[PDB]
Design a protein around this ligand. Structure first.
Ligand SMILES: Nc1nc2c(ncn2[C@@H]2O[C@H](COP(=O)(O)O)[C@@H](O)[C@H]2O)c(=O)[nH]1
Ligand SMILES: Nc1nc2c(ncn2[C@@H]2O[C@H](COP(=O)(O)O)[C@@H](O)[C@H]2O)c(=O)[nH]1
Ligand SMILES: Nc1nc2c(ncn2[C@@H]2O[C@H](COP(=O)(O)O)[C@@H](O)[C@H]2O)c(=O)[nH]1
Ligand SMILES: Nc1nc2c(ncn2[C@@H]2O[C@H](COP(=O)(O)O)[C@@H](O)[C@H]2O)c(=O)[nH]1
Ligand SMILES: Nc1nc2c(ncn2[C@@H]2O[C@H](COP(=O)(O)O)[C@@H](O)[C@H]2O)c(=O)[nH]1
Ligand SMILES: Nc1nc2c(ncn2[C@@H]2O[C@H](COP(=O)(O)O)[C@@H](O)[C@H]2O)c(=O)[nH]1
Lengths: 467, 467, 467
């Protein structure tokens, strides 16, 4: 990667340690650059939700797939649930988001708890397949918590048939007091709910789809047990992308698993990780892997840095591994150490074809967790690490193995009081990345990597700018 | 008044010191009792807003008059403003509330500041006399504060012609996401805005009107200066009720002013105060006064208790003065010491034909004050005493008089975060009074006075019940 | 009632205002006095759980019935649920408490939430009707929240057949690390769980049973609607005691309802309330009521004192009504104003044949509510008032009635960090009452009423003693 004159430090670079120098730009606006990835995962944005049991669910899968990003299902899940989630995701409209369907016999407490499942801010009360009312935080408040939803003072909704251009739903909702609108099928049955900002995003973002035009989905597999059989079964379950994840991706078990999956000839791209060394990436590439995940330790849920001292500054690892993979022709997605959109922008700047966010999406409306409330009423959610789920494995043996196993770390990921949904944070990330391209002056991600000028940044440098 | 057996205390009774014992009741529901007053002020509810410069304005005047209560304009106001307010109030629809009219050239900051002028929670953007949009706290937030209101994302409103029964506006607004509705004149021009709870109140409350069917209004006059000329001028200005208010209503100046106003033969009922003694009430009645205001010191803005030790427990004073006036045939409105609806209920229980609330309405949306915000974002407003305005009066003389004048007391009257409007607190007061009648078993206020059973209550007794 | 020489106040007496002077005693120990009630409700202790939707459930019903107290089911409940609760209560062992039955397929989160349903502190994992393990707060902590209960490290339990005397289960559990013990049926199926303190209470308390030896239960009915049909249906549902409750028990609707129920000849004792006057009690007695509930306003969830000023100090009302009822031969249970066991002791001292606790049991493990946790981890629960459920009653009519309806008051009732169960607080109340009898020197409640010496107590007097 390009480096500024006189910048020869005797130290590695992390996201906390780097900045990009803007260059001569010909890109007029941020909308003139495309974020389509070259890695072959078929995501139009370089954002993938990590394989978290607390952050990767069907709601995030469908939402991010409609927004143009891949979602990797967490490992150690019964294949029945995997198939159910895949079928649910593949049966989603390409433009309209699936709302919170509410049966008339649901309680007010259940409706209130379900209202925060999505970022729309409203849930649809549907009877016999036809939407009959709308609920929100306003009408729900004050009424008895275990009363039925049939007397929650259903509000009026803007009804339009499926197929209208986003312009029509937008200006129809220009003066609507409620941001959401019920997208209705031609027969009158409810097909989904589309929002004002959703209408805006329908043109900016192009959903990531497979050859059959269905929302792409991914899943993660470990190394313990028969990796080949599990990978083949998940591939038949409908997963578009297969990911092999482990705490240490440079062990011989990783190489054996990658070799087995490559020999399976499943046809899906191969994803392995994580390694923070160039030699590990070359070994994984030679083992039959197309994609190499990088980063062990910088992960916000990773504890091994404090317990063992292992790890690496993320930015130097990602740039070195990306250079090695491009020398071997492979492609790399950065994983770990992501807390701000600048982290994502630098991760693509280092050369990564795609990015792995991780625990940041734990603070979303659609994450598969419980939105509990603190004293200050600030919404937030708890992010968990997998620990043994990314580690290679009788009651005696189980307890003996678990004694030395690192505990499941817990953090309080705060929700934005206004922009709490995954949609607007994704918008922020995409806007930051587009601004990075405009400052560099690149029309696409490969040009962003080629034409970037990269500097080293210290701790005192972050005092510059608004936090 | 009726007193419980064995209750012969050697001490006076205040609102803090009394309770009412329920008796045999024949009134089925609270809606079966009428709150029409006998005092002749023509108010269908026993609530009058005090003569506060910070609490008595045109908005409170019109709102409370439409709700069935009289409003007394504060003294020491230029008669031009008095006439303007009277003309504004007399030109108000009997059912629909006047909204916050917003010209399209107003700024976002002005719109936000005006939105809290009324309890509707929304303001009407009106162009060429026709309403074109609706604004609220939702669309106003986020947009630039000094941007025009023409790009504040006006919302849709429910439009109905003037004359529809409250049932029609109610069920038309049953499923409306916005509580307010634009009441439009037959020609298409805006006539007012009516709310869901306003539609509910349109049947429960009957507005207080004069012989010409216009919202009744009242004004206050002092004793300093020519009382007769000022009273005659305000009567010609359109004030329905004339009130003579002073700190001490038992002085000879009060008697002279009452005699002059009675000799004026203005035709309006005579109101004088305040006296906390029976002999003062008899003197005021003999001076030519029909109504005697009672209470000096219990007022939440009154300071004379702490400065001089003067005053009286309110409840004993009001009951004694009401008994004296009924013996002389006069009628009395209790003034001061009102903080809870139980205070109002006891004030009517003592025998008062009407009640004076005072500083409690300072914590309202419609009060003529500035709604400032604290750290906890709790809305509140400051209540001021008149001081010298209720006291009998060169730079030397002015400063010499002002040195000994009691300072303008200031208090922080908190707004209810949900029920901040004057409408819902008035509803609470009326519900409490109706519950008092139902517990007593009285069909009207005279029966409430006649059939009430009254007990004495100590400090430890208030620990009973939910605060 | 007996009154101390020179005690002729001109003021009523509440629980905050009274104390009992100990007299010449012949009762050696507290265990030598019996708390059997004379009112005919058949409760061996003078404690009844109020008709609260948040405090009266099947768990409280069975627990308090086994402890010797009646439980009144709240009104406005579908008779199907009433019949289900009655059948559940009547099918409870006379000595052993019903534990928290846990299926092996339950999650750790569900087990943790259910563990606080009872005061035992442990839940039984039962498979095919046979208990296979024990869970508590210790083994549940640390393990994954959505893991199955089959791998929660089930502990060992003390197994005994049903029929062993409490001595045997006590000394068998003398050195048991776990207080609870699984009471097993002779065939091996689980019949219940009995605790060490439960074994202790099995001799002190005698469960309240009907003629068929089944745990007695009670239910509450309002006055709106057909009172006779509802009362007859609940009587056929299996309710032992019928209670007619309303906000104002002196209205003509109350008299009509009592007359109808008395004419029904249902055979159950008649309970009506609440009235705080002797004349109301006489009217209710003449209407065909055997029991008169007393107290409106002192209730910790009652708001009418602050809204309307109505009410009465509880102690004077209860003593006067008890004297009137005993003159007419009727019996009275005090209701409202109960926060300490001294309140109960004085309520029986005033002459009440039984006591109504109310919101105090809202802070229990077995109350039908959600045990949420604060920052200080102190357990507590929210107590609600019925409001309109104790008041006499289209969308327009519904909303119009609800506008004037008093809001559902909410309070934070703190749980004792150690003695959080209903069992130990009931023990405290019974110990206080027994101590009161010992200080008076009475062998039973009628002797307690007859031989009591009663004094008046001020606010400064409560500073005596440990709070
Ligand atoms: N009634 C209802 N429940 C829903 C809906 N969407 C999600 N849920 C609830 O959420 C569960 C799945 O949570 P998730 O894995 O999507 O975060 C479902 O099993 C169901 O309980 C909906 O539209 N309606
Ligand atoms: N060793 C280890 N790595 C973890 C754990 N939880 C998450 N990670 C890693 O950290 C990444 C997420 O971190 P983030 O990108 O949110 O900072 C995951 O995708 C995974 O690679 C854990 O418990 N142990
Ligand atoms: N533009 C506008 N200002 C209003 C409206 N109602 C009240 N105001 C503002 O409030 C002032 C009077 O305040 P008030 O005495 O009613 O509390 C007016 O002079 C004006 O500045 C309205 O409908 N539109
Ligand atoms: N002496 C005196 N009385 C006041 C003052 N401000 C208000 N009051 C009295 O107190 C009443 C309002 O008190 P409130 O009814 O709110 O407790 C007024 O109507 C007036 O009679 C003041 O500054 N001085
Ligand atoms: N699995 C299980 N749930 C119980 C048990 N006891 C109570 N519950 C739960 O508590 C509900 C009733 O709550 P309650 O009305 O008893 O407070 C039941 O419907 C069930 O969900 C028990 O022994 N086992
Ligand atoms: N008027 C009224 N009384 C209530 C309300 N909630 C409870 N109560 C009364 O207060 C009693 C409980 O009060 P406690 O005995 O807990 O102080 C109830 O049994 C009932 O008589 C309410 O919302 N309104």
């Amino acid at each position: 990667v390009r480096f500024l004159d006189g910048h020869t430090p005797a130290y590695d670079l992390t996201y906390n340690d780097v900045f990009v120098v803007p260059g001569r730009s010909d890109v007029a606006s941020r909308f003139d650059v495309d974020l389509s990835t070259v890695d072959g995962s078929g995501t139009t944005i370089p954002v993938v939700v990590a394989n978290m049991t607390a952050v990767a669910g069907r709601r995030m899968a469908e939402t991010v797939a409609r927004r143009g990003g891949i979602v990797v299902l967490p490992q150690d899940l019964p294949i029945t649930a995997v198939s159910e989630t895949v079928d649910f995701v593949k049966s989603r409209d390409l433009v309209v988001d699936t709302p919170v369907t509410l049966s008339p016999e649901d309680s007010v407490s259940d409706a209130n708890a379900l209202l925060h499942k999505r970022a729309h801010g409203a849930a649809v009360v549907v009877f016999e397949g036809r939407p009959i009312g709308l609920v929100t935080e306003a009408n729900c408040a004050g009424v008895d918590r275990f009363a039925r939803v049939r007397d929650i003072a259903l509000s009026d909704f803007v009804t339009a048939p499926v197929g209208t251009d986003p312009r029509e739903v937008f200006d129809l909702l220009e003066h609507a007091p409620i941001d959401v609108a019920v997208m209705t099928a031609p027969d009158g049955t409810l097909a989904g709910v589309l929002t004002r900002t959703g209408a805006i995003r329908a043109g900016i973002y192009t959903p990531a789809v497979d050859a059959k035009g269905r929302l792409r989905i991914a899943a993660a597999v470990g190394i313990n047990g028969d990796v080949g059989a599990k990978a083949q079964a998940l591939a038949e379950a409908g997963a578009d992308l297969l990911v092999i994840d482990t705490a240490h991706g440079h062990q011989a078990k990783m190489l054996d698993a990658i070799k087995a999956v490559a020999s399976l000839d499943l046809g899906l791209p191969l994803v392995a990780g994580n390694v923070v060394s160039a030699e590990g990436t070359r070994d994984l590439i030679e083992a039959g892997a197309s994609i190499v995940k990088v980063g062990v330790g910088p992960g916000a849920m990773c504890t091994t840095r404090m317990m063992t001292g292992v790890g690496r500054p993320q930015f130097s690892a990602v740039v070195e591994c990306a250079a090695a993979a491009r020398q071997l022709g492979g492609h790399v997605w950065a994983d770990g150490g992501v807390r701000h959109p600048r982290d994502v922008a630098l991760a693509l700047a280092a050369g990564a074809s795609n990015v792995m966010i991780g625990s940041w999406f734990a603070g979303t409306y659609e994450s598969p967790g419980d939105l509990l409330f603190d004293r200050d009423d600030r919404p937030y959610k708890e992010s968990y690490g997998m620990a043994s789920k990314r580690a290679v494995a009788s009651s005696f043996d189980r307890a003996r193995k678990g004694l030395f196993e690192e505990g499941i770390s817990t953090s309080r990921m705060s929700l934005d009081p206004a922009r709490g949904g995954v949609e607007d944070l994704l918008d922020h990330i995409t806007s930051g990345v587009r601004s990075t391209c405009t400052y560099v002056g690149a029309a696409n991600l490969p040009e962003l990597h080629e034409k970037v000028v990269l500097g080293v940044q210290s701790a005192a440098g972050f005092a510059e700018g608004h936090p």
